[PDB]
């Protein structure tokens, strides 16, 4: 019978204004024979018509696949606000129900520190410019580099990771060519969390 | 498509709207301009042992606990449907055929197997192999061959002799062609007398 | 029904001679009516009879049984499967998980330490950072010291899958700033199968 | 026994031990050589009027522990019996008349038309066991080995665990061994 899975939001996108969120609801496993998926939207049990269901999607030989998309407000989300999504179909007992909302709990502000290269490192024609963000809480955050303005794109981020005081921390790792880093550069960490003003900071590290 | 002696399209499980055809008619509807009808060959397909989700496709009747041959029986089976069904354009289709007629007649596994998988895998009586007769292949060319449309175009069609030798040339030899052809009829020489008949072309 | 969980053995413990590797095998979610749980094992689909079963654990009316199995660093190390199979009354089949070492060539841990960011020095805690990357494969052990006692006051990353195809991570000790400050040494250890010993240390003082 | 097509051994009244069926166990042990277990069937009696000592046997009723009973070796029983199934219903003396012989009298020995009630719910409650259930493919997978054990154990998933004989297997047609394990006391 068919399954039902309920992403939340990336969470840069509940915290930038320039971005808009979206909850997500995927139907598996969808028979050709009985294949009307109906969705219904609720927010905090009130029901709301300006989702986008997509057409189905065929995964293997007569099964498939149905997505359905729903705006969200940045302020429902951050404020904690419960989403619902109901999935009916012919092939159901009854309908299925999955509601999502976000972490909940007393949030703490990151502090972002930019780490250089080992002096070690400096042998490689590749080098590591390093990010630690700590302290923060809950998890969702977002870590992107930059330098002159044009993003950085060639960058590893950890997932966070509990730390002893119950908070979380991580550790995001660009690299560049050691010729761009003698040069002078300066490069530049965004971390983006619900408990920073404006969602945002920005830490610099160029050659000392 | 010009070199081919036969196109055979798989149409194995339903094809969606009412009656189960709406892929078969949409595609016909672009195959048409590249083939001949009697080019157009539409398949099912039989009970295959021990299938999975993804080659259930029901073109042959359940497995019955009280008639053991109901595997053979073709009464409101899609493979009778695919016998029966001819396109609405261009003329009757050249026929139909079978996926593993070395499985003809053997019942399809109930429709409470329909999401068994390789892993999760629940076995039935009607996934052991079995000699067959080939009963349902010959009751479907039967059918076929029984078909009044197939019936060859006669005088009473078309009466003047060196008429209906054109027409068939160009549209046909079976009645159910002349109420279908869609495209262009010359007529030449100085044989014909008169066009009684060429009034069936409805759709010429 | 019962469901199964197969762990591999800790990297420290197949990586280090005085350790005892381990592979364990978990059945949760037995029933109290059908509680006969039999487990069988396979290495390279060869059965061994050396396992050891620790019983039943309510963790209701529902028990939990443990099964362990000791492995050779040897066997470990060159990418034997471990197949555990576990039987049940309440099981329609008998359920077979599998778990082997991740297969390729094995690529040299790089460490460096890194010390604290001049921003964080305003701070009463401070962090000892240590980067390990393009390891493969991503069983690995970190751990630090200091004065030649360990330092406890530390977490790891996961591994994570580098653009390179490798692995790397961070580990992050905390001291006082004061025991930073004063220029005591401090270790990062890193425990590989593509060390010389499976092991190299690097240092990390004030500078 | 070999020209059988029953034995019906009555059991009427305790037949000793805590659960009193010690009797039935130890006779079994000695029928089974003769009999398989589909042949065999135990009886109660119900309440006959103006019975004497020697003739009384008396939830919670022997009928249904026969109903029940079943056993350890061989294959599942064949079913029960009742004595003077047109007493059906009729509710025994009490046990303060248990030496009341003929030279009593009680309500219950007067006669009444029955309606089978017991015999009904005793019926319902051997249909409605599950060891009576059939042998599938979830027991024994293969097919051909399927066919086999059935017809030398027998056709219920209950007389795995007990049959306790030989089983020959033969042919080309088994692939796998599956379910051969449930038969435990082969
Ligand atoms: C999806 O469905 C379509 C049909 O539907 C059509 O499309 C869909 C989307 C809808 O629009 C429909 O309306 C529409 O009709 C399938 O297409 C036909 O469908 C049937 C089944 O429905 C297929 O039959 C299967 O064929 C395989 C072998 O298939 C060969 O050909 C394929 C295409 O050409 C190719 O993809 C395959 O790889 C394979 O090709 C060959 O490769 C070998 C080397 O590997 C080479 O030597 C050959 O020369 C080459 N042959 C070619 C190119 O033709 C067959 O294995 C299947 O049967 C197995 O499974 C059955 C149960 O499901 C079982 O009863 C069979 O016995 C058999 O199983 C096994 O038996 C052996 C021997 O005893 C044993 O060793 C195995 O362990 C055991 N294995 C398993 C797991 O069961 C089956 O007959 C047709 O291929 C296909 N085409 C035609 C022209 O009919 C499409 O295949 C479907 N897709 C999937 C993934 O199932
Ligand atoms: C002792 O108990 C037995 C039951 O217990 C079993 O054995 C003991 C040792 C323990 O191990 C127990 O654990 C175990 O359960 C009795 O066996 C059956 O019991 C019932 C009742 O208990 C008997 O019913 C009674 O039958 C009387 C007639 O008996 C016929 O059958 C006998 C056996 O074949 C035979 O010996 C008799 O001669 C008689 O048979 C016929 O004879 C006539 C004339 O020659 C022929 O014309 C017929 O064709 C013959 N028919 C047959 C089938 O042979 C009844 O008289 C008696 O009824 C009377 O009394 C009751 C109250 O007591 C009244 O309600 C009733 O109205 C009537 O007045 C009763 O129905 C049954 O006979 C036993 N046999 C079977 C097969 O079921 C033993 O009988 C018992 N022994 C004694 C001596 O009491």
């Given at each position: 019978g068919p399954s039902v899975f309920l992403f939340p939001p990336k969470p840069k996108d509940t915290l930038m204004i320039s971005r808009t969120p979206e909850v997500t609801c995927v139907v598996v496993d969808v028979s050709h024979e009985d294949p009307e998926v109906k969705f219904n939207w609720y927010v905090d049990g009130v029901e709301v018509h300006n989702?986008?269901?997509?057409?189905?999607?065929?995964?293997?030989?007569?099964?498939?696949?149905?997505?359905?998309?729903?705006?969200?407000?940045?302020?429902?989300?951050?404020?904690?606000?419960?989403?619902?999504?109901?999935?009916?179909?012919?092939?159901?007992?009854?309908?299925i129900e999955k509601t999502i909302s976000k972490a909940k709990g007393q949030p703490r502000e990151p502090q972002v520190y930019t780490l250089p290269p080992s002096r070690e490192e400096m042998t490689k024609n590749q080098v590591s410019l390093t990010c630690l963000v700590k302290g923060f809480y809950p998890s969702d955050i977002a870590v992107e580099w930059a330098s002159n303005?044009?993003?950085?794109?060639?960058?590893?981020?950890?997932?966070?990771?509990?730390?002893?005081?119950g908070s979380f921390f991580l550790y995001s790792k660009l690299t560049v060519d050691k010729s761009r880093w003698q040069q002078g550069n300066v490069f530049s960490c965004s971390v983006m969390h619900?408990?920073?003003?404006?969602?945002?900071?920005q830490k610099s590290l160029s050659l000392s | 498509?010009?070199?081919?002696?036969?196109?055979?399209?798989?149409?194995?499980?339903?094809?969606?709207?009412?009656?189960?055809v709406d892929t078969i008619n949409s595609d016909w509807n672009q195959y048409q301009n590249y083939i001949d009808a009697s080019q157009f060959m539409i398949g099912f397909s039989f009970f295959e042992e021990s299938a999975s989700?993804?080659?259930?496709?029901?073109?042959?009747?359940?497995?019955?606990?009280?008639?053991?041959?109901?595997?053979?029986?073709?009464?409101?089976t899609r493979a009778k449907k695919?016998?029966?069904?001819?396109?609405?354009?261009?003329?009757?289709?050249?026929?139909?055929?079978?996926?593993?007629?070395?499985?003809?007649?053997?019942?399809?596994?109930?429709?409470?197997y329909?999401?068994?998988?390789?892993?999760?895998?629940?076995?039935?009586?009607?996934?052991?192999?079995?000699?067959?007769?080939?009963?349902?292949?010959?009751?479907?060319?039967?059918?076929?061959?029984?078909?009044?449309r197939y019936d060859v175009i006669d005088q009473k069609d078309i009466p003047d002799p060196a008429l209906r030798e054109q027409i068939i040339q160009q549209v046909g030899q079976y009645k159910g062609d002349l109420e279908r052809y869609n495209k262009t009829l010359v007529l030449t020489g100085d044989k014909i007398q008169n066009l009684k008949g060429l009034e069936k072309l409805?759709?010429?």
């Open positions: 989702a986008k269901t997509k057409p189905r999607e065929e995964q293997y030989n007569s099964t498939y696949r149905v997505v359905s998309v729903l705006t969200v407000l940045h302020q429902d989300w951050l404020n904690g606000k419960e989403y619902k999504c109901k999935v009916s179909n012919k092939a159901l007992p009854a309908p303005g044009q993003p950085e794109n060639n960058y590893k981020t950890t997932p966070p990771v509990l730390d002893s005081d619900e408990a920073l003003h404006n969602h945002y900071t | 498509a010009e070199d081919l002696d036969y196109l055979l399209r798989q149409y194995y499980g339903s094809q969606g709207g009412e009656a189960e989700k993804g080659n259930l496709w029901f073109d042959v009747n359940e497995y019955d606990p009280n008639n053991p041959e109901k595997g053979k029986d073709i009464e409101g695919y016998a029966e069904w001819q396109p609405s354009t261009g003329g009757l289709k050249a026929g139909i055929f079978s996926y593993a007629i070395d499985r003809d007649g053997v019942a399809h596994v109930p429709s409470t329909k999401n068994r998988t390789s892993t999760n895998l629940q076995r039935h009586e009607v996934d052991n192999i079995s000699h067959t007769d080939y009963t349902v292949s010959r009751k479907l060319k039967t059918l076929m061959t029984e078909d009044k409805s759709k010429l």
